[PDB]
Design a protein around this ligand. Structure first.
Ligand code: ZH8
Length: 513
């Protein structure tokens, strides 16, 4: 392994973070090594933060200007100057902590300048603050209360619900309560939001909301508004698909069958309309090799930043440089960006390691690897998932040390295609044998089998129903996994096709119920 001094000479990157983390967790960083260190951390969040602050806990940070203001409590707040008073009253917990006499006083003080404060102050002098804020139609206060406690739930009138989307907090709020199935009175009130007043994801989610109460008309209008406003074509297609499912206008399905975006919805539309399968590019570079060390994590991280920080002209220079068999995953990575994501790249690198698996298992492996890494051997994620199949270190060690007992096993073996594909196959077997559907497998690869089993046990998920299974696909409670499923499923269809082992996507959907 590389020492801390040798890491310090490399550019900040997720690779460097990973390796610093690995020293940390094996307790190989002294208090003296850890001094100048958070100048060397590319992204100072998560576990590397936790770990480095067990050595050097951070004193900061409260602004030197308001330092005075954090020396008062709910007992001494009326002794605070007027700035200090207003600063501390940013916290709804602080306000809750005050007694009701002090709230009445402070509320008189602020009714002129800060009636936002006044309203919250007076709100916490009632048994139900939300109800007070709702009656005042204080939008800022509504969201402060929502962030403070998710437990307030109350019917909102048309006037008020239509003001809510104007606030930055609305999107997360709506997605939260609709996916989690919380705040039933909020959700029911959101049926009266005018579609004119929302766009993009908010409008999409309000469409899902409307379906759950069997309000198909409002749902369509919500989905329509989502389709017209969405930035990405994939999302636009998701919304058009619903537009069609609800009303069945063939204009909508045709638009969807003709989409440039390859996704489960455009694939399904093409199947229903007898539209041919989309053009999949074919990359067979003659040249066999170049310099590039495909096993070097640091080399990838630098070439990666070059590919993001590159004008459409610098890309052509990289494309030609990496036009080899050895660097085929990079070639395709560059190409994908270069042609502005209009062409469809579905490579099959390191094929010898999977050619003996049945074709259906091959497709799943490839589908997962495409989404997880675009087949970059030394790919590292923000949570330090490793290699082409993006194994979390816990699971990689459990498999390699305990289950497959590989000799001299290190987790950096996940950077090896032969290992990635083999551990991938192993883990996929465990999941397929319990879940069957490759969609369900995909949810569990990403978010674990506990989460997936909890979801399938539910009465209202992946059961029979008017809009099933598409509705349940919209209600998978982890956003990361909800998206991952859709994408891996589309990769699966495509890879089964390229492997001369086609399946109708409608068959996939029937076996979800
Ligand atoms: C390298 C990386 O961060 N991969 C993550 C992957 O990132 C999606 C990627 N998507 C794309 C898309 C186009 C080009 C390149 N990439 C990537 O390199 C990675 O997202 C998954 C969840 O959906 C994560 O589990 C996975 O670790």
């Amino acid at each position: 392994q590389y020492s801390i001094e040798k890491l310090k000479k490399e550019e900040n990157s997720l690779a460097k973070d990973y390796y610093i983390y690995r020293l940390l967790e094996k307790n190989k960083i002294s208090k003296k090594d850890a001094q100048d260190l958070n100048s060397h951390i590319f992204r100072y969040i998560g576990k590397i933060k936790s770990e480095l602050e067990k050595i050097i806990p951070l004193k900061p940070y409260i602004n030197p200007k308001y330092a005075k203001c954090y020396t008062y409590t709910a007992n001494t707040i009326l002794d605070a100057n007027l700035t200090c008073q207003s600063v501390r009253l940013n916290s709804l917990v602080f306000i809750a902590s005050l007694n009701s006499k002090d709230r009445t006083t402070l509320a008189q003080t602020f009714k002129n300048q800060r009636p936002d404060l006044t309203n919250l102050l007076l709100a916490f002098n009632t048994s139900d603050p939300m109800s007070y804020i709702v009656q005042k139609e204080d939008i800022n206060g509504f969201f402060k209360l929502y962030n403070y406690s998710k437990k307030y739930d109350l019917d909102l009138n048309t006037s008020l619900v239509n003001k809510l989307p104007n606030h930055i907090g609305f999107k997360d709020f709506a997605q939260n309560i609709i996916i989690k199935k919380e705040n039933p009175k909020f959700r029911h009130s959101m049926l009266e939001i005018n579609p004119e007043n929302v766009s993009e994801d908010s409008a999409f989610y309000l469409g899902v909301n409307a379906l759950t109460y069997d309000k198909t008309e409002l749902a369509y209008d919500f989905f329509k508004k989502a389709a017209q406003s969405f930035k990405s074509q994939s999302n636009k297609d998701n919304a058009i698909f619903w537009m069609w499912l609800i009303k069945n206008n063939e204009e909508d399905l045709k638009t969807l069958s003709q989409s440039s975006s390859l996704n489960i919805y455009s694939l399904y539309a093409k199947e229903l309309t007898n539209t041919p399968f989309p053009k999949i590019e074919s990359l067979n570079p003659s040249k066999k090799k170049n310099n590039f060390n495909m096993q070097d994590p640091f080399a990838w991280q630098k070439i990666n930043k070059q590919i993001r920080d590159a004008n459409a002209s610098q890309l052509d220079v990289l494309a030609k440089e990496f036009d080899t068999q050895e660097t085929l995953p990079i070639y395709a990575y560059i190409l994908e960006r270069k042609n502005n994501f209009k062409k469809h790249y579905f490579i099959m690198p390191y094929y010898d390691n999977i050619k003996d698996y049945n074709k259906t298992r091959q497709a799943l492996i490839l589908a997962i690897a495409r989404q997880e890494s675009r087949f970059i051997p030394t790919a590292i994620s923000v949570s330090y998932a490793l290699g082409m199949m993006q194994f979390m270190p816990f699971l990689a060690n459990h498999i390699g040390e305990k289950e497959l007992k590989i000799p001299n096993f290190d987790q950096d073996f996940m950077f090896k295609p032969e290992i990635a594909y083999y551990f991938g196959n192993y883990h996929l077997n465990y999941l397929e044998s319990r879940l069957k559907s490759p969609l369900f497998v995909a949810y569990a690869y990403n978010g674990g089998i506990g989460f997936t089993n909890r979801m399938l046990a539910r009465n209202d998920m992946f059961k029979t129903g008017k809009f099933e299974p598409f509705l349940s696909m919209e209600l998978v409670p982890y956003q990361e996994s909800r998206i991952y499923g859709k994408k891996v499923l589309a990769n699966y269809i495509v890879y089964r096709h390229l492997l001369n082992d086609s399946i109708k996507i409608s068959d996939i959907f029937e076996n979800l119920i």
